Amino acid sequence: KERLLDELTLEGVARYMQSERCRRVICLVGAGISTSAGIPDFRSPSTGLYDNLEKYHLPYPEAIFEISYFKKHPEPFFALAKELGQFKPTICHYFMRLLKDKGLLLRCYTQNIDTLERIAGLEQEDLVEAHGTFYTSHCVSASCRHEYPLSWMKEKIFSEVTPKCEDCQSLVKPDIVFFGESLPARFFSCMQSDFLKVDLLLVMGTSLQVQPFASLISKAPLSTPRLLINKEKAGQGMDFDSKKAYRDVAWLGECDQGCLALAELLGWKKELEDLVRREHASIDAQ
Amino acid sequence: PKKTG
Ligand SMILES: *C(=S)CCCCCCCCCCCC
Ligand SMILES: [Zn+2]
């Protein structure tokens, strides 16, 4: 256990980041970085968007995202999907874009399916979309696998007609990883290479409750500093407070503010706000 | 291996 942060604070992390020792940063991100876009966190205790779905009489809220339940009762999921593209990436997303443009970003691992990282301008090389994406959709039957674009799916969703394969009549499923499905091979492939060489783990907007994604915090070497920007402490192995704490830092608050506070310390606050402004205005002018 | 929790 070599000690790489001089102190366990945001400022300490900021100084380490500006040091020659920090060349490779991995970001693990979850639902917290997209809630200011308006996409609610569907595992948060007080979450406010299963409201409409009372008519479907769910065995419990989470069933909607279970693969077994979905395949027999897809309607609740698609009604949710019509309520929710219209979302621009947030400050958190553009901070990651900033890390890439400054040559610090090794990779962003995301739990989110909203595709906001790509919109913010992270390229496909830089991203591991651990739970897949809404962008593309597939017929669920092994011997058809017909591909349908977002355009097609949205037409079906907005009309409240359950998406169905035009060829074989099977269910058409967005390319996301439902609970009980396997993660993409890219996830397992990238983790084997990425985590050997990482100098800093930035964990943002995730309570680290979904496996195997959550186990990624364990994969970096023992000396690797780990910063959690989140509403509350999570991943507790993450040791923030014990007298044996040596490398993990928690910044508790909304992720956007954490990224602004961190960016401020690195001297990038101005470049960040300018980037966000220009990128938003470009999406508006679309 | 499978998405859980
Ligand atoms: C594993 S944590 C992924 C769960 C899937 C969540 C899907 C949320 C509903 C889709 C809303 C559409 C956003 C553009
Ligand atoms: Zn088909």
Is any ligand 1 atom within 6 A of the Cβ of residue A111? Answer: yes
Task: Give the tokens for residue A186.
Answer: 């890219």
A59: tokens are: 């065995």
Chain breaks in chain B (C to N over 2.5 A) after: none
Residues 176-205 of A with CB under 8 A from B: 177-183
- The DSSP call for residue B2 is B
The SS3 assignment for A44 reads: coil
Q: How was this structure determined?
A: X-ray
The answer as to CATH 3.20.20.140 being correct for domain A1-35+90-130+185-286 is no
Task: Give, as one character, the DSSP assignment of residue A42.
Answer: T
Residue A228, token pair as written in the block: 């959690």
Specify the DSSP class assigned to residue A87: P
- Which positions ≥6 away from A100 have C-beta within 8 Å? A121, A122, A126
Distance between Cα A257 and ligand 1 center (Å) = 24
Taking residue A198's Cβ as centre, other Cβ atoms within 10 Å add up to 20
Catalytic residue check, A73? no
Query: What DSSP character marks residue A62?
Result: G
Shortest-distance atom of ligand 1 to CA A39: 13
Please give the Cα distance from A146 to A139 (Å, whole number).
5
Mutate to test the pocket of ligand 1, among A42, A113, A114, A207 (most ligand atoms within 8 A of CB): A113
Q: Residue A155: what are its φ and ψ, rounded to 5°?
A: -50, -50
What residue type is assigned to position A98 of the chain? L
Q: Which residues precede chain breaks (C–N over 2.5 Å) in chain A?
A: 84, 236
Q: Is the CB of A112 under 6 A from ligand 1?
A: no
Tell me the sheet residues that pair with A27: A108, A202
For A36-89+131-184, CATH number? 3.30.1600.10
Report yes or no: A247 at the B interface, CB cutoff 8 Å: no
Give the mutation target among A65, A67, A178 for probing the ligand 1 site: most ligand atoms within 8 A of CB: A65
Instruction: Identify the sign of the CA torsion A9, A11, A17, A20.
Output: negative
CATH code 3.30.1600.10 region(s) in chain A: 36-89+131-184
The phi and psi torsions of A196 (rounded to 5 degrees) equal -65, -40
Radius of gyration of chain B (CA): 4
C-alpha to C-alpha distance for A44 and A207, rounded to whole angstroms: 9
Report resolution in angstroms.
Answer: 2.1
Tokens of A155: 């037409």
| Range list for CATH 3.40.50.1220 in chain A | 1-35+90-130+185-286
- CB-based burial, A128-152: b 16+ in 10 Å, e otherwise: bbbbbbbbebbbbeeeeeeebebee
Read out DSSP for A11-33?
HHHHHHHHSTT---EEEEE-GGG
Q: Which of A131, A211, A215, A216 to mutate to test the interface with B (most CBs of B within 10 A)?
A: A211
Question: Is residue A90 within 8 Å of A34, Cβ to Cβ?
Answer: yes
Rounded Cα distance between A267 and A14, Å, is: 10
Q: Which residue has the tokens 């019509």?
A: A82
DSSP assignment, residue A216? G
Enter the tokens of residue A73: 């009762």
Q: Does ligand 1 lie within 6 Å of residue A37's CB atom?
A: no
Q: Edge-to-edge, what's the strand order for the sheet holding A132-139?
A: A147-149, A132-139, A172-176
Which residues make Cβ contacts (< 8 Å) with residue A278, sequence separation at least 6?
none
